[PDB]
Amino acid sequence: YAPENLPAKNNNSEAFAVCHIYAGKNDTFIHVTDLSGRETIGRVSGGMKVKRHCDEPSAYAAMQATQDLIEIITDRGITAVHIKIRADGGTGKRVYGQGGSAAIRALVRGGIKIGRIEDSTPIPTDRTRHKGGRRGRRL
Amino acid sequence: TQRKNPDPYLKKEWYPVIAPAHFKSRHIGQTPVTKTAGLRVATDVINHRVYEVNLGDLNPGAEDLNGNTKFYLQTQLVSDGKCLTNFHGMDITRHKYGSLFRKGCDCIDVFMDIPTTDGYLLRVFVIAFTDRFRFQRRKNCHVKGRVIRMMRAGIYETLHNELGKVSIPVLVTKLSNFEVNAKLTEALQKITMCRDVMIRRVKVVKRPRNTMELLSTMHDSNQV
Amino acid sequence: PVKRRNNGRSKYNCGHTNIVRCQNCHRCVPKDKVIKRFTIRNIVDNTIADDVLNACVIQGFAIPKLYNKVQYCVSCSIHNHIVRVRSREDRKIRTP
RNA sequence: GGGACGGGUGAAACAGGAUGAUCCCGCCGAGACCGCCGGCCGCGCAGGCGCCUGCCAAGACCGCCUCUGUCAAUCAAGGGCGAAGGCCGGGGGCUAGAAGGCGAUCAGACACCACCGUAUUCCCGGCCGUAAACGGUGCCGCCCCGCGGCCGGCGCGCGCGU
Numbered sequence: 001y002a003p004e005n006l007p008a009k010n011n012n013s014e015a016f017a018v019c020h021i022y023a024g025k026n027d028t029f030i031h032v033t034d035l036s037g038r039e040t041i042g043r044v045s046g047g048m049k050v051k052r053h054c055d056e057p058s059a060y061a062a063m064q065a066t067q068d069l070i071e072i073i074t075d076r077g078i079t080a081v082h083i084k085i086r087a088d089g090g091t092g093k094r095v096y097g098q099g100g101s102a103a104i105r106a107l108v109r110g111g112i113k114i115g116r117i118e119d120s121t122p123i124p125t126d127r128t129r130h131k132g133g134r135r136g137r138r139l
Numbered sequence: 140t141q142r143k144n145p146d147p148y149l150k151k152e153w154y155p156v157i158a159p160a161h162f163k164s165r166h167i168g169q170t171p172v173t174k175t176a177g178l179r180v181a182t183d184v185i186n187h188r189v190y191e192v193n194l195g196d197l198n199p200g201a202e203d204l205n206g207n208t209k210f211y212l213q214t215q216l217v218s219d220g221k222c223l224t225n226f227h228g229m230d231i232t233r234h235k236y237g238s239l240f241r242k243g244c245d246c247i248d249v250f251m252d253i254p255t256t257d258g259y260l261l262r263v264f265v266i267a268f269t270d271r272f273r274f275q276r277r278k279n280c281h282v283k284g285r286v287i288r289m290m291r292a293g294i295y296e297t298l299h300n301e302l303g304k305v306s307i308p309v310l311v312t313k314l315s316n317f318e319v320n321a322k323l324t325e326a327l328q329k330i331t332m333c334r335d336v337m338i339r340r341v342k343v344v345k346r347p348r349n350t351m352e353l354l355s356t357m358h359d360s361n362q363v
Numbered sequence: 364p365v366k367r368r369n370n371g372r373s374k375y376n377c378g379h380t381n382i383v384r385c386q387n388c389h390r391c392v393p394k395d396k397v398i399k400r401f402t403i404r405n406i407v408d409n410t411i412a413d414d415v416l417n418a419c420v421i422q423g424f425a426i427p428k429l430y431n432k433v434q435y436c437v438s439c440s441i442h443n444h445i446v447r448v449r450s451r452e453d454r455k456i457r458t459p
Numbered sequence: 460g461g462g463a464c465g466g467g468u469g470a471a472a473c474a475g476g477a478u479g480a481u482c483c484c485g486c487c488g489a490g491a492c493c494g495c496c497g498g499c500c501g502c503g504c505a506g507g508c509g510c511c512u513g514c515c516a517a518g519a520c521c522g523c524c525u526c527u528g529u530c531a532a533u534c535a536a537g538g539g540c541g542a543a544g545g546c547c548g549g550g551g552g553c554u555a556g557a558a559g560g561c562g563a564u565c566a567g568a569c570a571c572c573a574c575c576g577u578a579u580u581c582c583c584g585g586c587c588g589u590a591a592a593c594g595g596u597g598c599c600g601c602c603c604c605g606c607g608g609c610c611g612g613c614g615c616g617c618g619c620g621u
């Protein structure tokens with residue numbers, strides 16, 4: 001990469017991006033964007049690193065994906081990131097999966113500085129009807 | 140059916156992003172963009188972008204007072220290889236909102252439409268909670284209806300009087316400070332107990348098509 | 364016969380109450396009969412809170428919390444050990 | 460923008476993806492809904508009742524040296540209201556979802572689990588008149604151990620606290 005294809009360097013601060021974590025019950029997504037969300041620097045998923053469907057949201061796959069992503073973004077010239085941790089939401093579980101914490105620790109142990117952290121789960125002030133019926137999943 | 144493509148980051152270049160003069164740290168950061176080709180022009184594509192910035196990073200210090208407020212800015216004009224922004228809206232964080240709530244208390248939420256002298260029309264949202272008297276025998280802290288209506292009326296009056304009509308820069312300064320919250324509380328505290336009183340967020344509904352004099356006004360230190 | 368004086372719910376001075384959905388099976392339950400707990404937890408598990416704080420650049424930053432309310436049905440609370448089947452004399456105890 | 464999977468499950472397989480999906484952001488459209496506060500709180504004859512603002516009529520309770528003077532209680536016949544589903548005639552069409560279709564599981568599975576989906580669910584006018592319509596306890600009236608909590612109104616006392 002030519003120097004103009006990387007962020008400029010200045011002593012006042014460092015290169016700051018924001019990472020979006022999707023800690024779902026069936027998959028994990030690790031996504032890096034600019035300060036706005038209109039550009040994308042690196043995107044990895046847990047299903048690229050396992051052969052078993054039931055292991056896609058596992059922590060191990062999340063860590064492997066995170067290491068690959070930090071490699072890419074470091075090559076692209078990013079050093080610090082903000083965090084946006086998110087669950088499925090939308091009249092759903094509203095509880096994080098097991099890959100989120102693994103992703104966070106993988107970022108921390110990859111020599112990446114941390115800024116701010118916040119919940120981004122989409123929650124409503126009103127509810128459309130969810131699936132299952134009034135007797136629920138009976139099994 | 141898969142194919143490989145060349146790396147798109149070999150034809151990129153970054154721009155800096157700048158904040159208004161109401162704040163100390165005016166370097167938001169940098170944004171990438173693709174070099175102009177055909178009709179695509181970077182100075183046009185990056186024209187309207189929205190950046191969410193925490194108030195504690197715009198004003199270093201006062202972390203315990205500024206860490207739970209975050210407004211976002213929008214670029215209006217690209218010049219000198221750098222992007223200029225103005226106010227677009229304000230909000231608090233989710234954890235603070237969740238922390239505000241407690242069982243046994245009452246919650247009041249109010250919104251009013253507030254126009255400006257510059258042609259912006261804004262909708263604001265105000266939240267309040269009741270508290271416990273110092274020597275209250277009972278555990279619950281609910282109140283009667285007349286008190287509730289007095290509190291709503293006082294909120295409307297205070298909001299009208301302090302924000303009835305004001306320019307964007309003055310409003311931004313007031314929001315950066317917390318004087319509107321202070322007025323809301325001391326007016327309400329005169330009626331009853333007030334656990335918390337603040338502004339949840341500010342939305343912009345309509346603005347004029349051209350804001351050039353306003354942008355030139357917001358982005359210089361001395362005029363304000 | 365009758366097992367509980369409350370008939371398994373907290374319904375006083377009313378005829379009907381609004382319904383809720385169990386968060387596990389999505390069963391419809393009356394609001395007065397559903398089991399409710401409030402939890403407060405850290406976004407980052409406490410094992411790596413120190414690591415995150417060390418990596419944090421800001422000064423004096425505090426770890427945000429999660430504030431959620433969990434609502435479960437009778438069958439799911441028992442299966443997940445949220446409540447326990449008690450003795451005839453211990454059914455009257457109301458303290459936690 | 461970016462480039463290879465994604466969805467879903469106990470585990471899987473049907474539907475989606477180089478015509479660029481999943482993911483990030485911004486705008487647009489339509490129709491439902493009213494969250495955390497929310498409760499041995501409350502209102503209503505019962506059925507039932509929760510966004511902002513405004514309008515209309517109503518109701519029980521307390522306080523009173525205001526008025527009338529038995530005007531009352533309960534009830535065949537008769538009249539009115541009455542969850543959800545359902546029906547007729549008009550509107551609307553987003554979620555879910557009887558019927559139907561399809562993938563799994565099983566000896567079989569036309570069921571439970573997964574996915575798609577019509578009537579219905581929403582509004583107006585009108586029928587039907589049923590529910591574990593339950594406090595499984597009819598309405599009016601008198602006496603009655605002790606302790607405690609909450610809601611509304613009124614009065615007493617003081618060192619003035621809801």
Ligand SMILES: CC[C@H]1CN2CCc3cc(OC)c(OC)cc3[C@@H]2C[C@@H]1C[C@H]1NCCc2cc(OC)c(OC)cc21
Pocket residue numbers: 139469564571572
């Ligand atoms: C309703 C679908 C049934 C289909 N199968 C048969 C094979 C099987 C094997 C399992 O071993 C790993 C298994 O573990 C969860 C589940 C199944 C399902 C069982 C399903 C029957 C269903 N009702 C009876 C008991 C039961 C217990 C269950 O354990 C939680 C279960 O998982 C969702 C489903 C069922």
Ligand SMILES: [Mg+2]
Pocket residue numbers: 138139
């Ligand atoms: Mg079961």
Ligand SMILES: [Mg+2]
Pocket residue numbers: 364
């Ligand atoms: Mg029995």
Ligand SMILES: [Mg+2]
Pocket residue numbers: 378379
């Ligand atoms: Mg009932």
Ligand SMILES: [Mg+2]
Pocket residue numbers: none
């Ligand atoms: Mg109906």
Ligand SMILES: [Mg+2]
Pocket residue numbers: none
């Ligand atoms: Mg009966």
Ligand SMILES: [Zn+2]
Pocket residue numbers: 385386387388389434435436439
């Ligand atoms: Zn549940």
